[PDB]
Amino acid sequence: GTHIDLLFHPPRAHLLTIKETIRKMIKEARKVIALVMDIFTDVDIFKEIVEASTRGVSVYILLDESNFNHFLNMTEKQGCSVQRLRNIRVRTVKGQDYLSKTGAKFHGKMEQKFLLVDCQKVMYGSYSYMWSFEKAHLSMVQIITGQLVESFDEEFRTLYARSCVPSSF
Amino acid sequence: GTHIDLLFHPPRAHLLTIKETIRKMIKEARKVIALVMDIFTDVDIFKEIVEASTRGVSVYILLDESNFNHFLNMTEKQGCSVQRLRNIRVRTVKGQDYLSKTGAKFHGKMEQKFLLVDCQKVMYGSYSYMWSFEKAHLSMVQIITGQLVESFDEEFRTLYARSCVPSSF
Ligand SMILES: CCOC(=O)c1cn[nH]c1
Ligand SMILES: CCOC(=O)c1cn[nH]c1
């Protein structure tokens, strides 16, 4: 009982771009937005998220730990101290711990990208929220409704349990 | 009429790893394997593909253009001249053309990855065929059967039309 549509960038036969469909999904949020993302520097999508939070929507954002400073650098340039917005919680996720042949311990990355709105609709795919995905790259997403959404909801809760408050904060 | 299962790396509550499930799909192929991948340096998955082609399976591989020589280097260090395997065709795909800040002409990346076998089963997700995805990163894939598979078959044809013979050849 799952329906899935595809969208591409650059766009193919469909009316809206991937970025226009992201904005739509955020503006249609009534209760909760859950986002997992590797790099987030797109100002227009950030402005939609902040506008949702001001109307009372709870916003939970999980960013790859190694790329977090790109997000922070964006929010400060826009004159926003994001840590002051009580309806938004931003936390970081690490990849696996591993040991290099020089013996230093490192961690890798969270390679996972999805937007989950009101525990009811998902956009999943290879599009990251940065300028290079508008101008440079080819990407694709699924728009998902029905039973599969429940599995994205479980996985979000599992990453949220693992996630940490960012060290800058 | 689409069925979907999720798998994770590191693994969760499923018996097989992502890499074991990829090997299974390739071993189960009877007629054709279609792969789109950004970076391909895993020697064990390469060996399964070559074995399939020796069985008479037709193999079509689409690789991101910028990363192609990492693939070719791996096949050469394995003692294989991949150019001579008639049942495999390897071609490259480029992202969009664009102008940088300084006015230089560059192209972006194909950010797409999926495995399509016998026009009937797809593995789609964030796992790339390289060492870092086994040891360092968190990733996820979907295993897809039913009507949505037709949409992946159409997109593979469209990307195969766009694709080029690699410049390195
Ligand atoms: C972190 C609190 O939020 C959740 O766990 C969530 C949000 N939507 N579905 C699950
Ligand atoms: C001739 C290139 O191969 C395809 O178009 C294909 C393979 N499986 N589905 C479509």
Curated annotation (Swiss-Prot), chains A, B:
It is found in: Cytoplasm; Membrane. Interacts with EGFR; positively regulates EGFR inducing its autophosphorylation in absence of stimulation by EGF. Interacts with RAF1; displaces 14-3-3 proteins from RAF1 and activates RAF1 within the RAS/MAPK signaling cascade. Interacts with AKT1, PIK3CA and PIK3R1; activates the PI3K/AKT signaling cascade. Directly interacts (via DUF1669) with casein kinase isoforms CSNK1A1, CSNK1A1L, CSNK1D and CSNK1E. The gene is FAM83B. All members of the FAM83 family of proteins share a conserved N-terminal DUF1669 (domain of unknown function 1669) domain of about 300 amino acids. This domain mediates the interaction with casein kinase 1 (CK1) isoforms. Therefore, it has been proposed to rename DUF1669 the polypeptide anchor of CK1 domain. Phosphorylated in vitro by CSNK1A1. This is Protein FAM83B. Belongs to the FAM83 family. The chain holds residues 118 to 286 of 1011 of the full protein. The lineage of its organism: Eukaryota, Metazoa, Chordata, Craniata, Vertebrata. Probable proto-oncogene that functions in the epidermal growth factor receptor/EGFR signaling pathway. Activates both the EGFR itself and downstream RAS/MAPK and PI3K/AKT/TOR signaling cascades.
